[PDB]
Write a protein that binds this DNA or RNA. Structure first.
Ligand code: MG
Ligand code: MG
Length: 739
RNA sequence: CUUGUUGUAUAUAUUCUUUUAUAGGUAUUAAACAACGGAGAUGAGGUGCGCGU
DNA sequence: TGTCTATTTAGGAGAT
DNA sequence: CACGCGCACCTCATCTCCTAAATAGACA
């Protein structure tokens, strides 16, 4: 495993934005040449031209004249079946002798080998590899249906070849024992694979021809790889350069050779590589060859690489804790009843209910659902409904929000004056996360409004919707992005999100070390993605309230009998400009409707703002150097399932086939689970059982493999959700919801 | 070189910002806890805005 | 006439 | 379900790459 360390240069360095810019321009010229000649030239022409121009017996010319590559397009040099260095050398020398990139030197007279050959050309080739190695016709990895449509069979044969990187029948023979010597082989699938082999034998040449045609037709007009105009980074791979420590200092020195002589760049020190540690030696002994020069905030940074010894522990399963992430009442609800035993732990829902100011404002049924959380180990009391009372002045939670904030900010000073640093940081970041999300909402809504205003004022007039050039030219020439107004908002938003990310990382570090210090050897999360987040419904927009919905200039007494629009007219969300006699003209958002839309956007924006899906990544990153490891479980299963009987609720479909139900149906009103427990406490106790029970563990997760970097100890299985269901019925852990 | 990046001060001043207002900008003051594999490219998705349907 | 720096070339992926 | 064409923003996924020896050229 290789890690990177970034240093900051001290003083003046010859590397500036001019050198980086010419590096980027060279990259773009070489990439343009490759893009133009990607499907036009043969490797044979290149190899022959170098053979007849220079004259040598090297291997990178022989490999281009070997009847395996002569009558092949240049894009085959970027595949994985071609030697990764012969292709580099052949392409480099064909480009160099013809001087196609337009190389005229570089500003600092950096060695051409370190700047052109293993500089921008190496990046060009590496980038074109990823494109062409990931260039394939996306076909479903499904069952071939045995003797299905001949078109289906032929596509199945060809796709599975590149799916498993096959070449010929020699690849099929290794596949035979692969499914014959496996537990529970799918005999029906094995017959399909037998048919796949049978049809492969007769029409193998047809497969090659179709594969060759499709790949070229997928690069008919690619446009090439382009280095963006904001990159501000150059990469040089130098074999012989020296990094030394500064004398009686914590800094370093980088003696790279500029213009046939060795320069000296002085670097600041890193606590990451602090003196006398076991990682400063790992750095100074095993550092790599690539040097990255990057400019961030008009300051130059140098990035190195070194070999690191991974030491991630193995799973233990002696102690386990679940953890559900749901952006409803508390962010992190875990699966341990709070009994005042976790050392260093602070419970904020127990703290808040001990003060009469907060409890008095709560109704009878709110105290009953706050006491539920005050007994469960929970983190980050992010109250979305209370938080929106900072943006909405005429709200009903405006008084609860102030008391909640006052108590939390008082705890923040109490913890600081008692010198409890970890808890103080946790609470301080909780407060700041709550404060920063409203700022992000404010700025994003202002960006939306200032885009609307700009586009209404400009009044871009374009023809019928057919194409890009067919549309107005002013759009590309004067886009909202390049307007100075929007350019500043996008920096304000970047800074706000930058604070949000750090506060979230601090909270997650608090949780991880809390569970590590006490003795827990696994933290179980679920593989959450953006689909789980239940978006609130935004009111239909005015521009499409009457145009799409066919309610444009329609009778006031009866516009239509659509029930949803009926509901929206029941309240005063919408205003309608009536005509002379019972029609519509225009609609304007009323105050209640506008604030309802804002409330719908405020809850929705936090799926992307607060990294709902990527919370698991922080725990996985912390697990690399920590004692406690992390297990991931399949999503869309734990929340609904009952943690008392350990079974899945389901509803009988019209056909009578059992259908797994949805979270909303298995949840009572008041957002409580029909089991009687909290909705998040229930899911946490489910995530735990899928890791505590050996029988369940093999169903949902994947087998323990050797430790890696940023890889969970237990990962979600690749088996399909339906396949999970059938195993979940083998163990009979299944129930019928209401029949 | 009591050293890099980010986070953590409801800290002191403000003729500042409603386009960060329990926060930030501009200058001072306090340290101590944490985490830290980077660069580039390609692709997918969501969201906003205009034009029309 | 050593001595440092820059250039050329590396062949033919397999087991999992 | 909004639909299509563009101007953008962000978040997320996946891939390449992080070498080493021999040799020629540039110096005093
Ligand atoms: Mg900040
Ligand atoms: Mg700092």
């Amino acid at each position: 495993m290789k890690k990177s360390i970034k240093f900051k240069v001290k003083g003046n360095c010859p590397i500036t934005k001019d050198v980086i810019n010419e590096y980027k321009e060279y990259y773009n010229k070489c990439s343009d040449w490759i893009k133009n000649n990607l499907t036009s030239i043969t490797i044979g022409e290149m190899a022959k031209f170098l053979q007849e121009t220079l004259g040598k017996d090297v291997a990178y010319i022989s490999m281009g004249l070997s009847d395996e590559w002569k009558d092949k397009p240049l894009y085959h040099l970027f595949t994985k079946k071609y030697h990764t260095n012969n292709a580099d050398n052949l392409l480099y020398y064909y480009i160099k002798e013809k001087n196609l990139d337009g190389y005229k030197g570089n500003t600092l007279n950096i060695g051409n080998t370190f700047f052109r050959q293993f500089g921008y050309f190496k990046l060009v080739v590496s980038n074109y590899r990823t494109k062409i190695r990931t260039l394939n016709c996306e076909i479903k990895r499904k069952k071939i249906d045995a003797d299905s449509t001949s078109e289906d069979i032929e596509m199945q044969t060809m796709y599975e070849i590149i799916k498993h990187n096959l070449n010929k029948k020699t690849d099929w023979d290794e596949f035979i024992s692969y499914i014959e010597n496996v537990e529970n082989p799918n005999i029906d699938n094995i017959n399909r694979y037998k048919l796949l082999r049978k049809c492969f034998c007769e029409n193998e040449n047809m497969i090659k021809n179709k594969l060759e045609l499709l790949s070229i037709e997928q690069l008919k007009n690619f446009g090439g790889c382009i280095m963006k105009q904001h990159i501000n980074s150059m990469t040089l791979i130098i074999q012989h350069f020296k990094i030394e420590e500064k004398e009686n200092s914590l800094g370093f020195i980088l003696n790279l050779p500029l213009n046939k002589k060795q320069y000296q760049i002085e670097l600041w020190g890193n606590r990451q590589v602090n003196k006398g540690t076991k990682e400063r030696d790992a750095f100074l002994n095993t550092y790599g060859e690539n040097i990255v020069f990057i400019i961030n905030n008009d300051e130059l940074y140098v990035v190195f690489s070194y070999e690191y010894e991974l030491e991630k522990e193995e799973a233990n399963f002696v102690k386990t804790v679940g953890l559900d992430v749901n952006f409803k009442h508390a962010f992190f609800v875990t699966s341990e009843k709070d009994n005042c035993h976790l050392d260093g732990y602070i419970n904020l829902y127990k703290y808040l209910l001990e003060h009469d100011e907060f409890t008095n404002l709560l109704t009878n049924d709110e105290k009953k659902d706050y006491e539920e959380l005050s007994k469960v180990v929970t983190f980050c009391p992010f109250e979305n409904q209370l938080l929106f009372a900072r943006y909405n002045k005429m709200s009903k939670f405006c008084k609860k929000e102030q008391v909640l904030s006052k108590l939390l900010y008082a705890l923040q000073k109490q913890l600081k004056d008692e010198n409890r640093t970890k808890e103080y940081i946790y609470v301080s970041c909780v407060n700041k996360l709550r404060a920063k999300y409203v700022s992000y909402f404010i700025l994003k809504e202002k960006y939306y409004e200032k885009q609307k205003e700009y586009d209404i004022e400009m009044g871009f007039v374009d023809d019928s919707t057919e194409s890009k050039e067919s549309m107005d030219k002013r759009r590309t020439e004067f886009p909202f992005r390049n307007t100075p107004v929007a350019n500043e908002l996008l920096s304000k938003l970047n800074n706000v999100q930058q604070d949000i990310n750090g506060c979230l990382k601090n909270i997650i570090n608090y949780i991880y070390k809390i569970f590590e210090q006490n003795g827990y050897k696994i933290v179980a999360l679920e593989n959450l993605e953006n689909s789980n987040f239940e978006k609130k419904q935004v009111l239909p927009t005015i521009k499409s309230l009457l145009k799409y919905h066919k309610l444009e200039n329609q009778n006031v007494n009866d516009i239509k009998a659509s029930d949803k629009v009926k509901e929206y007219i029941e309240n005063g969300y919408y205003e309608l400009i009536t005509n002379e006699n019972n029609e519509i003209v225009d609609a304007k958002y009323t105050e209640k409707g506008a604030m309802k839309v804002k409330n719908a956007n405020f809850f929705n924006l936090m799926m992307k703002s607060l990294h709902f899906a990527s919370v698991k990544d922080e725990f996985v990153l912390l697990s690399n150097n920590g004692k406690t490891q992390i297990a991931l479980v399949p999503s869309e299963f734990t929340s609904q399932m009952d943690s008392t009987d350990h079974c899945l609720y389901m509803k009988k479909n019209d056909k009578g086939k059992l259908v797994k139900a949805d979270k909303k149906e298995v949840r009572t009103k008041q957002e409580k689970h029909i089991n009687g427990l909290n909705a998040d406490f229930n899911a946490a106790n489910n995530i735990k059982y899928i890791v505590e029970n050996e029988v369940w563990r093999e169903i949902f997760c994947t087998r323990p493999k050797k430790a890696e970097y940023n890889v969970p100890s237990l990962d979600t299985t690749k088996k399909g959700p339906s396949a999970i269901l059938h195993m979940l019925k083998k163990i009979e852990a299944i129930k019928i919801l209401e029949t």
